[PDB]
Amino acid sequence: GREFGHLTRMRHVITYSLSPFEQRAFPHYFTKGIPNVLRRTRACILRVAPPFVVFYLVYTWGTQEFEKSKRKNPAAYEN
Amino acid sequence: GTHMSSTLASVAATRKLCQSFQTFNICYAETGLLGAHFVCDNMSIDDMMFFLQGQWMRLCTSATESEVVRGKNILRNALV
């Protein structure tokens, strides 16, 4: 059913590989990894962060508002 | 057929795993290619490879005298 041999039909695709004992496990890990991470972060920061920033603003206001509510009201004890 | 002395050949004949396979030793001045080449159906390659590799491992770990004598006779016949 789902086995290597009849999954799909592919033609004229040549793949070149290398032995894991002939290549480095961390090739250019920081020279190319760090720029790549920045690219990925930049592409997603404007789609992931903004919703969470709203939560932080709501969380701060709610915490402050709850504190203010418990605070003493001088006008209530006037007269 | 299935009575071939080579265990890989016997398995290939019995299970219909391979249309044709052959081991080769292509030597060059300072290097060479030592291995095998086979022609198989779509759904057989894996199995064939398995058995082929197993054969190699046997020779690396457990090779007996009778099969070595047979191989020596085969090599003598090929040379002559």
CSV table of C-alpha atoms in Angstrom, one decimal, chain A:
chain,number,residue,atom,x,y,z
A,1,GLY,CA,0.0,0.0,0.0
A,2,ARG,CA,2.3,2.8,1.3
A,3,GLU,CA,5.8,1.5,0.7
A,4,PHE,CA,8.9,2.6,-1.1
A,5,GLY,CA,8.4,1.4,-4.7
A,6,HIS,CA,4.9,2.6,-5.6
A,7,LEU,CA,4.3,5.9,-3.8
A,8,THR,CA,4.7,8.1,-6.8
A,9,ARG,CA,6.0,8.4,-10.3
A,10,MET,CA,9.0,10.7,-10.8
A,11,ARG,CA,11.2,11.0,-13.9
A,12,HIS,CA,14.5,12.7,-14.9
A,13,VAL,CA,15.5,13.7,-11.4
A,14,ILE,CA,19.1,13.1,-10.5
A,15,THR,CA,20.2,13.3,-6.8
A,16,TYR,CA,23.8,13.6,-5.7
A,17,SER,CA,24.7,12.8,-2.1
A,18,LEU,CA,27.7,12.2,0.1
A,19,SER,CA,28.8,9.8,2.8
A,20,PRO,CA,28.2,11.1,6.4
A,21,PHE,CA,31.9,10.1,7.1
A,22,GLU,CA,33.1,12.3,4.2
A,23,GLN,CA,31.4,15.6,5.2
A,24,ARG,CA,31.3,17.8,8.3
A,25,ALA,CA,28.3,17.5,10.6
A,26,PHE,CA,28.3,21.3,11.2
A,27,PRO,CA,29.3,22.9,7.9
A,28,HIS,CA,29.4,26.7,8.4
A,29,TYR,CA,27.2,26.4,11.5
A,30,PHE,CA,27.5,30.1,12.5
A,31,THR,CA,28.8,31.8,9.3
A,32,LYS,CA,25.6,30.8,7.4
A,33,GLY,CA,23.3,29.7,10.3
A,34,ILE,CA,23.2,33.1,12.0
A,35,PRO,CA,22.2,35.1,8.9
A,36,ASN,CA,19.7,32.4,8.1
A,37,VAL,CA,18.1,32.6,11.6
A,38,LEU,CA,17.9,36.4,11.2
A,39,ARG,CA,16.1,36.0,7.9
A,40,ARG,CA,13.6,33.5,9.3
A,41,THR,CA,13.1,35.7,12.4
A,42,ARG,CA,12.5,38.8,10.2
A,43,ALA,CA,10.0,37.0,8.0
A,44,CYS,CA,7.9,35.9,11.0
A,45,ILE,CA,8.4,38.6,13.7
A,46,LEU,CA,5.6,40.7,12.1
A,47,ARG,CA,3.1,37.8,12.0
A,48,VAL,CA,3.8,36.1,15.4
A,49,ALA,CA,4.8,38.9,17.8
A,50,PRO,CA,2.0,41.5,17.2
A,51,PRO,CA,-0.7,39.2,18.7
A,52,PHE,CA,1.4,38.5,21.7
A,53,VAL,CA,2.3,42.1,22.2
A,54,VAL,CA,-1.5,42.8,22.5
A,55,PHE,CA,-1.7,40.2,25.2
A,56,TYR,CA,1.1,41.9,27.2
A,57,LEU,CA,-0.7,45.3,27.0
A,58,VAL,CA,-4.0,43.7,28.1
A,59,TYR,CA,-2.2,41.8,30.9
A,60,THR,CA,-0.6,45.0,32.2
A,61,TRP,CA,-3.8,47.0,32.1
A,62,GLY,CA,-5.8,44.2,33.7
A,63,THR,CA,-3.3,43.9,36.5
A,64,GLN,CA,-3.1,47.6,37.0
A,65,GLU,CA,-6.9,48.0,36.8
A,66,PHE,CA,-7.4,45.2,39.4
A,67,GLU,CA,-5.0,46.9,41.7
A,68,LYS,CA,-6.7,50.3,41.3
A,69,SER,CA,-10.0,48.7,42.0
A,70,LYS,CA,-8.9,47.4,45.4
A,71,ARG,CA,-7.4,50.8,46.3
A,72,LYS,CA,-9.2,53.0,48.8
A,73,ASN,CA,-11.6,55.6,47.4
A,74,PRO,CA,-11.3,58.8,49.4
A,75,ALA,CA,-14.7,60.1,48.2
A,76,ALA,CA,-16.5,57.1,49.6
A,77,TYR,CA,-15.3,58.0,53.2
A,78,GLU,CA,-15.9,61.7,52.8
A,79,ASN,CA,-18.4,63.4,55.1
